[PDB]
Give the backbone structure.
Amino acid sequence: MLKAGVHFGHQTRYWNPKMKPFIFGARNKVHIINLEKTVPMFNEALAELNKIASRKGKILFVGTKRAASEAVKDAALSCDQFFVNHRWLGGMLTNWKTVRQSIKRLKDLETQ
RNA sequence: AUGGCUGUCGUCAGCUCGUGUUGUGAAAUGUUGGGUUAAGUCCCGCAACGAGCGCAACCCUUAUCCUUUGUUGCCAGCGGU
Ligand SMILES: [Mg+2]
Ligand SMILES: [Mg+2]
Ligand SMILES: [Mg+2]
Ligand SMILES: [Mg+2]
Ligand SMILES: [Mg+2]
Ligand SMILES: [Mg+2]
Ligand SMILES: [Mg+2]
């Protein structure tokens, strides 16, 4: 059910057509999500993340946009995870070898 | 045919690479954009992240002062010359 009750989408003239099945749509020419559809999907996502947690992996929050920057760099980092809060450097994962060097430099300066 | 050495554009600020990404491909990005500088100088932004040769600095000389030493260099204070 509406365990949330705070999700209403963007204007209608900016909608991606392949989001049709998830759109309820109505007032003020602004799309509104179908919460009755999100809840099963959100629950399944949480279940899958929990299984990943059981395997003890990394989940790497990504919240670069200037609306949840602190919301990502908060107790969201409390338990076993990592996060990207500001600009996502291009290739942070595709070439981890080169970014690895910057991390080593950062660690050296922290101890320095 | 060449080594070595030299002039020149020009002491101009440019020239490149690894990995990543884009393109079927030649290639592109980075190196572009907003400011700024003598400078690809620096900051911010950014599918780029780093690095190298260049710029700058390290070199010599000149402009001020201090310590040291005082002859063949010097003469402010003392003696008569
Ligand atoms: Mg390709
Ligand atoms: Mg160039
Ligand atoms: Mg280019
Ligand atoms: Mg510029
Ligand atoms: Mg430079
Ligand atoms: Mg740039
Ligand atoms: Mg006399």
Summary: The helical segments of chain A are 35-54, 69-72, 96-111.
